[PDB]
Design an enzyme around this catalytic site. Structure first.
Site, mmCIF file in Angstrom:
data_model
loop_
_atom_site.group_PDB
_atom_site.id
_atom_site.type_symbol
_atom_site.label_atom_id
_atom_site.label_comp_id
_atom_site.label_asym_id
_atom_site.label_seq_id
_atom_site.Cartn_x
_atom_site.Cartn_y
_atom_site.Cartn_z
ATOM 1 N N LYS A 1 -4.521 -0.520 10.181
ATOM 2 C CA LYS A 1 -4.827 0.348 9.009
ATOM 3 C C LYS A 1 -5.734 -0.321 7.936
ATOM 4 O O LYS A 1 -6.699 0.270 7.482
ATOM 5 C CB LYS A 1 -3.544 0.824 8.318
ATOM 6 N N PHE B 1 -7.547 13.285 1.173
ATOM 7 C CA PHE B 1 -6.754 12.390 0.326
ATOM 8 C C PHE B 1 -6.836 12.723 -1.155
ATOM 9 O O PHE B 1 -5.792 12.741 -1.833
ATOM 10 C CB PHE B 1 -7.157 10.943 0.556
ATOM 11 N N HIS C 1 0.362 9.464 5.560
ATOM 12 C CA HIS C 1 -0.264 10.607 4.892
ATOM 13 C C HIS C 1 -1.271 11.246 5.795
ATOM 14 O O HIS C 1 -1.485 12.455 5.706
ATOM 15 C CB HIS C 1 -1.015 10.200 3.612
ATOM 16 N N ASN D 1 0.844 -1.197 0.000
ATOM 17 C CA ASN D 1 0.000 0.000 0.000
ATOM 18 C C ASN D 1 0.890 1.262 0.000
ATOM 19 O O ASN D 1 0.467 2.333 0.431
ATOM 20 C CB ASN D 1 -1.043 0.002 1.136
ATOM 21 N N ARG E 1 3.704 -11.739 1.393
ATOM 22 C CA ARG E 1 2.246 -11.493 1.425
ATOM 23 C C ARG E 1 1.395 -12.525 0.653
ATOM 24 O O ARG E 1 0.160 -12.557 0.779
ATOM 25 C CB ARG E 1 1.920 -10.073 0.895
ATOM 26 N N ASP F 1 -2.361 6.256 8.518
ATOM 27 C CA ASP F 1 -1.062 5.930 7.949
ATOM 28 C C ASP F 1 -0.274 7.246 7.764
ATOM 29 O O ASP F 1 -0.750 8.302 8.171
ATOM 30 C CB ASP F 1 -1.248 5.120 6.642
ATOM 31 N N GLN G 1 -11.870 12.210 5.533
ATOM 32 C CA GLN G 1 -10.517 11.815 5.125
ATOM 33 C C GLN G 1 -10.453 11.715 3.588
ATOM 34 O O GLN G 1 -9.593 12.334 2.941
ATOM 35 C CB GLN G 1 -10.119 10.479 5.768
ATOM 36 N N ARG H 1 1.465 0.867 -7.456
ATOM 37 C CA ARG H 1 1.882 -0.447 -6.962
ATOM 38 C C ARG H 1 0.633 -1.322 -6.751
ATOM 39 O O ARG H 1 0.512 -2.398 -7.356
ATOM 40 C CB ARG H 1 2.722 -0.289 -5.671
HETATM 41 C C1 LIG Z 1 1.086 10.518 -3.027
HETATM 42 C C2 LIG Z 1 -0.102 10.060 -2.186
HETATM 43 C C3 LIG Z 1 -0.900 10.811 -1.333
HETATM 44 C C4 LIG Z 1 -1.854 9.967 -0.796
HETATM 45 C C5 LIG Z 1 -2.936 10.381 0.219
HETATM 46 N N1 LIG Z 1 -1.628 8.765 -1.309
HETATM 47 C C6 LIG Z 1 -2.352 7.515 -1.117
HETATM 48 C C7 LIG Z 1 -3.738 7.492 -1.095
HETATM 49 C C8 LIG Z 1 -4.410 6.291 -0.939
HETATM 50 C C9 LIG Z 1 -3.718 5.079 -0.851
HETATM 51 C C10 LIG Z 1 -4.444 3.727 -0.652
HETATM 52 C C11 LIG Z 1 -5.048 3.894 0.723
HETATM 53 O O1 LIG Z 1 -4.461 3.548 1.684
HETATM 54 N N2 LIG Z 1 -6.332 4.548 0.774
HETATM 55 C C12 LIG Z 1 -7.000 4.919 1.977
HETATM 56 N N3 LIG Z 1 -6.636 4.756 3.265
HETATM 57 O O2 LIG Z 1 -7.580 5.401 4.028
HETATM 58 C C13 LIG Z 1 -8.490 5.999 3.207
HETATM 59 C C14 LIG Z 1 -8.155 5.724 1.932
HETATM 60 C C15 LIG Z 1 -8.924 6.218 0.708
HETATM 61 C C16 LIG Z 1 -10.209 7.017 1.014
HETATM 62 C C17 LIG Z 1 -10.269 7.693 2.385
HETATM 63 C C18 LIG Z 1 -9.754 6.803 3.518
HETATM 64 C C19 LIG Z 1 -2.329 5.116 -0.890
HETATM 65 C C20 LIG Z 1 -1.656 6.320 -1.029
HETATM 66 N N4 LIG Z 1 -0.562 8.817 -2.160
#
Ligand SMILES: Cc1cc(C)n(-c2ccc(CC(=O)Nc3noc4c3CCCC4)cc2)n1
Length: 307
Positions: A235, A302, A256, A135, A190, A254, A298, A140
């Site tokens: 997560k 995002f 971000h 993730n 995995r 996570d 969120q 990926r």
């Molecule tokens: C460069 C960048 C910036 C961001 C925010 N990402 C990124 C976004 C998404 C994912 C997959 C993921 O994990 N999605 C989610 N996790 O929690 C939520 C979601 C989605 C909906 C809202 C709750 C991985 C990376 N990549």
């Protein structure tokens, strides 16, 4: 007959309509903002991908969300499946109001990022989409979900030079061969975890009706139950809870989320000790600012962070 990815230009006969303001849903913001990884813009402003073992192309104007299916044009049955996928029952405008009235940072961001909503995904699909990869990054996971689908899910149709397989069933994933095969695809260790969770769901919980019961259950129970599965930690479980098990209050934490919390909200762990402890705290933090639909809040930030 050879089948092309359709447009609104190539074959108007083959499209139905759901009445849907561009204020309640922007497809360019939802279909590749990290919720589902199976949608692709094959021609400009047209989204094609698998849904419940049928291939769809989607597009929209200011008024109307236009749908076509590849199995004739969509039914009531098939349009009710999109309505519940996009969760159009819920007024996003009444959330972008309530989040505005408590969060000045939202109100600024939400001017430019209208119509971000959550998808109601298939529990099986969502669960395995999030455990097959790090993730790390959208590209990926999108590639791994495709490789996984290409080798374990049934071939469905060719469109232009692209062959669509459905999402694998638990039995294909749970077999005594699954791992060695999965490791060809690059899943690494995995692959162990993919087999064992499929094995566990079929042979210890009653199969996918288990996940349907978690969808019925309250947040805390389903989360906890999701973490008993191999390869699933805190997560991923909140992802599934948010995105497939009708727990809008889930806030998957996570790096971000951390980055947004800190830069944009001034947040730091009150523990004064990123950890299991502090992450739980950050998700409490966001639930309490944003309310019962916190995950959906969120989702917007995002979308805004990817641009
Ligand atoms: C460069 C960048 C910036 C961001 C925010 N990402 C990124 C976004 C998404 C994912 C997959 C993921 O994990 N999605 C989610 N996790 O929690 C939520 C979601 C989605 C909906 C809202 C709750 C991985 C990376 N990549």
């Amino acid at each position: 007959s050879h089948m092309r990815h359709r447009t609104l230009s190539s074959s108007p006969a083959l499209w139905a309509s759901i009445p849907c303001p561009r204020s309640e849903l922007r497809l360019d913001l939802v279909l590749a903002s990290g919720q589902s990884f199976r949608w692709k813009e094959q021609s400009p402003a047209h989204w094609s991908g698998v849904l419940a073992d049928q291939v769809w192309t989607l597009t929209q104007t200011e008024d109307q969300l236009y749908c076509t299916v590849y199995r004739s044009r969509p039914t009531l049955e098939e349009l009710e499946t999109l309505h519940k996928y996009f969760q159009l029952d819920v007024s996003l405008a009444q959330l972008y109001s309530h989040w505005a009235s408590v969060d000045s940072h939202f109100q600024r961001v939400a001017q430019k990022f209208q119509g971000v909503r959550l998808l109601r995904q298939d529990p099986t699909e969502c669960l395995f989409s999030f455990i097959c990869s790090s993730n790390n990054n959208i590209a990926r996971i999108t590639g791994m979900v495709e490789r996984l689908c290409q080798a374990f899910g049934p071939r469905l149709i060719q469109l232009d030079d692209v062959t669509y397989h459905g999402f694998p069933n638990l039995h294909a994933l749970a077999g005594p061969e699954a791992e060695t095969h999965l490791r060809k695809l690059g899943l690494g260790y995995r692959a162990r975890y993919v087999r064992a969770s499929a094995k566990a769901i079929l042979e210890e919980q009653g199969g996918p009706a288990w996940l349907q019961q978690l969808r019925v259950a309250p947040y805390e129970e389903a989360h906890k139950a999701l973490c008993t599965l191999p390869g699933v930690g805190a997560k991923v479980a909140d992802c599934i809870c948010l995105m497939a098990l009708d727990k809008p209050q889930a806030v998957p934490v996570d790096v971000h989320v951390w980055q947004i919390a800190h830069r944009d909200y001034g947040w730091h762990p009150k523990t004064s000790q990123p950890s299991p402890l502090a992450n739980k705290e950050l998700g409490n933090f966001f639930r309490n600012l944003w309310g019962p639909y916190a995950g959906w809040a969120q989702a917007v930030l995002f979308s805004a962070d990817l641009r």
